[PDB]
């Protein structure tokens, strides 16, 4: 129960003050006490979790507890807590929730940035709290689709202390050895859902430099840069593990394989050479259907128009991903078995693969 | 005639000063007097409208009139008028026009921004006028084309007090209830003509959230943001009203319909469900042509390669928009009437529609 | 040899001081002396050119020479030399090289920008040198490919005093008369390799305004803009001179021709009208191959799916660039010679050309 709890934290704050050493050393010890308690106790975001009727009962005890700590100490504590300490002593939970609410989406009544920090007035007539640090945004990968033509991924900023439009975002590919880097511009965003089209024709020339490419979201605020590793929060990955995309580069074949890391479950891209006939079989089904089968893993191809090229003939077709390791190319006419063996080239809607 | 006119405005300025109340209250009343007169009288942009020979005759009378108002008052008047008041008293119309000229395109001899405001020196050797506010840009929609694959729109900033390169622009879709938002990056710009390619594959996932999407141009200068509603100034809209684009989304069909609002003639996008066979007929013409007819409104499709898919066969074709509600798909071979009834799938160059 | 050389420069610095005129006029004459010597002598970048063992022998003599010039003068010399003058007197070549190293890629131990200038601490514990100007980046065009559908060019910043991520870049097309302009956004970048996809459908409407379009790279740092003319440093151009791309615009045909200027060997784009049948021949080879031959210059087309349209029939094909002025369209079926003469329309994968 609230005031039985904050009763206790009040007395602990009292004894830190009546310990036996200097004045300013007690507040530093005390300042660390409420950085942690507001970060890791019941107090964090109580105005959004507790239902609205019981929260009046919460702010009284918090108020008497926060009344016990001197106003001096609000300068050494983490900057984003100064408003909550102030409305705690004032037992003002319309504004206390507003603040905790204001941090989640970055919607303040009035605000602006100064020196890369926030100055916020949370409601009309209330003071401005100045110099509030900007914490790292939480990112959830809410979509991830890919084929042999592009990768489409959606990253959703679930929590960020600053609203849409005042920051820039890019998708960052960082090699595991940190030596090489790729940046993909934003394609479109709907509120805080950020969608990136990674065209493999754009990144084919740079991928061979390293095998492991880790995915980050870069978020820039003027010149303060956040590097957010992405993947550990996500919607359910839509493919069987090791599902890959076929890449063709300087007469050689490669696979691009998304996967999730062992230590922290983040998403990365594995790029390595293959031998096409060891990885994918090509067979004739009926007289007008070509079937591509991933032998060890699924390969996803873009659906739509396709063609097969012989040395003196060509046939159009329609490609469809019938299963996660099986692709059907429905040809526009019959192909004899003897000529099927002489396919020189296979094309999807945007890519060509010389056999 | 000029000095008969500015004669009068001089005497009106004289009587505001000889009214009977405090000193600073007269200038505020006076400051509002010339905010309006420069905004809504013959004086606005006279150096660009009047032909060059008669303007010398204008600046003398303006000079004697502006000579009557104290230099004190140039601090409470709208910031962008301070240069014109100064060159008025100086009866300097080479610089007066230069200023009015300088505001139209944002081409100053010397300038830079400070606190989101302009500090301008209009000619060599002349003073710097500091702290000039930036008014909202005028936008004209100079192109708007669309099909079932993308929207291409060109927005031209006809007037803006700051030159190309120092601001950013994005295309904003804002739901009528302000709840949801889409931002499209700039695709290319030629001087102050800004072209946006809105790929429907990029926005298909976000459109179903609301029916009405209003079009804005966002213009950002550091952190000062302008929201400009667009459409009321435009070149002639190139389609018959209610012309739409067909969208396919999770087995369901929709229309995306550009239109212009009743109250202020701005352009918006209407997204709503349809029943394909109630809206579009598909018929065979001759033996090798498929005709799509919009029954209630025209539907625009991307011209170029297309195909029709049957359950065990496929046929390529060429799509052409023969009229605004009629589309022809010229097939590569004949199709029997009995098989035309068994078309399972229809594809344009970039989109697929399962029947 | 080092100290025989810097011996001399020391004495020259001595006599500039013992000349007969004012104090501050000698330092200005002296300040210009070491702007040039560090810019155009053995001293420039010696810590990166000389091999590591012999450089200790270099910094002693430089030290005694730089010891002779007063510390007063480091304020009037070019800002980026202040660290090297300081570590010269200190004969500190671990830090001297670090600085020269730090300028090449823009990798400082600690730094930030202030007023569009750098404040740098080069190693842990060392002072901060403040107010360092940012010189123009060196640009090398490391790739340039094009066809009738897009231009793909890669620009590599070989040297830039500021690391990736803190600046923006755009590709600029500037008409020779400076009247018209085109800006192409960045498509992707890998470290300091910046790739631009210039879609001709995006720039077709703006190209007719002028014939000569010069290529620049714009680099923006807050509001300080660099205009870097590109082309004179490049990898070997991949096409024969005058190789062009065919453009179709309002029933008329044009060529877009990259070329390099006479005076400074920079790359530009020439846009001018042609008569299709005077520039490109179309002939039948065998019964299923259409050959496009550039008569006066090569024309590059995008490889992949293509089609030819007759007034009541259409044929798909595969386009391949067999030589730099010869293109083969391998049709899906035979075409009679009498119907080949009645081709109304020719399509590549993304473009259409009405004959």
Numbering used by the authors:
A (entry chain A), B (entry chain A), C (entry chain A): 217 to 571
Cite, word for word, the article reporting this structure.
In this article we describe the crystal structure of TarS, an enzyme responsible for the glycosylation of wall teichoic acid polymers of the S. aureus cell wall, a process that has been shown to be specifically responsible for methicillin resistance in MRSA. TarS possesses a D(91)XDD motif with aspartates coordinating a metal cation, a feature that is typical of the GTA superfamily. Altogether, TarS features a novel architecture with closely-associated trimerization domains connected by a linker region to three protruding catalytic domains that face away from each other.
Limited (thermolysin) proteolysis of the purified full-length TarS protein resulted in crystals diffracting to ~ 2.3 Å resolution, with SAD phasing using an iodide derivative revealing cleavage of the N-terminal region of the catalytic domain (1–216) and the structure of the TarS217-573 as described. Two C-terminally localized regions in the TarS217-573 structure (encapsulating the trimerization domain), designated here as C1 (353–495) and C2 (496–573), were also observed, where a series of β-sheets of unique sequence participate in an extensive trimerization interface (buried surface area: 6970 Å2, predicted as stable by PISA) and connect to a linker composed of 2 anti-parallel β-strands and an α-helix that leads into the catalytic domain. Another interesting feature is the close proximity (4.0 Å) of methionines (M521 and M532) from each of the 3 different monomers at the bottom surface of the trimerization interface, forming a hexameric methionine cluster that we hypothesize may be involved in promoting plasticity/adaptability of TarS during multivalent interactions with substrates or potential cell-wall partners. Furthermore, structure-guided mutants aimed at disrupting the trimerization interface (M521R, M532R) resulted in the expression of insoluble protein aggregates. The overlap of the TarS1-349 and TarS217-573 structures with regard to the C-terminus of the catalytic domain and the linker region (217–349) further allowed us to superimpose these domains relative to each other and to the lower resolution full-length structure, providing us with essentially high-resolution views for the entire span of the TarS structure. Given the prominent electropositive charge distribution along the surface of the TarS C1 and C2 domains leading into the active site, it is likely that both CBM domains may be involved in polyRboP binding.
